[PDB]
């Protein structure tokens, strides 16, 4: 059913919230933090961040960019092959307007961090004001609606 599909989804994405935690409070101060953050939550579970029997990965940007990619085991949760990631990407807030962290962060702008969510569509994150973040791939009918 997808609304199962949307709940198992939904159940992986809690997985994700101590990373973004861990970016607002010690991996937003400084570049030098930000990516002190990345390499210490990605070498957890082997290297993959957060994992279990539903989600592959909860994996940070590579190049320190602070945005999340959740990975679900395609197979076991009833989604496509290629369909099966979620995005996280976080902004400063700065009170007036939002900046993506990476830009941010290097120039030294701090506030506080909101976050987009995005699938296959990005509805839900482009309607709350977000600019400029990647797709991710779960198919919005699997989405949880702050996803799509």
């Given at each position: 059913d997808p609304f199962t599909v949307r709940t198992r989804v939904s159940e992986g994405l809690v997985l994700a919230e101590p990373a973004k935690l861990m970016i607002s409070t010690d991996g937003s101060a400084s570049t030098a933090d930000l990516t002190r953050a990345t390499t210490?939550?990605?070498?957890?579970?082997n290297?993959?961040?957060?994992?279990?029997?539903?989600?592959?990965?909860?994996?940070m940007d590579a190049g320190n960019t602070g945005v999340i990619t959740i990975t679900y085991v395609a197979d076991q949760v009833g989604l496509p092959t290629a369909g099966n990631?979620?995005?996280?990407?976080?902004?400063?807030?700065?009170?007036?307007?939002?900046?993506?962290?990476?830009?941010?962060?290097?120039a030294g702008t701090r506030g506080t961090i909101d976050w987009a969510c995005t699938s296959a569509s990005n509805a839900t994150a482009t309607a709350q004001g977000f600019t400029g973040m990647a797709a991710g791939s779960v198919p919005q009918e699997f989405a949880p609606a702050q996803c799509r």
């Open positions: 210490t939550w990605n070498q957890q579970s290297n993959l961040g957060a994992s279990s029997k539903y989600v592959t990965s909860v994996l990631t979620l995005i996280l990407s976080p902004y400063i807030n700065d009170g007036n307007t939002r900046t993506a962290l990476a830009t941010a962060v290097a």
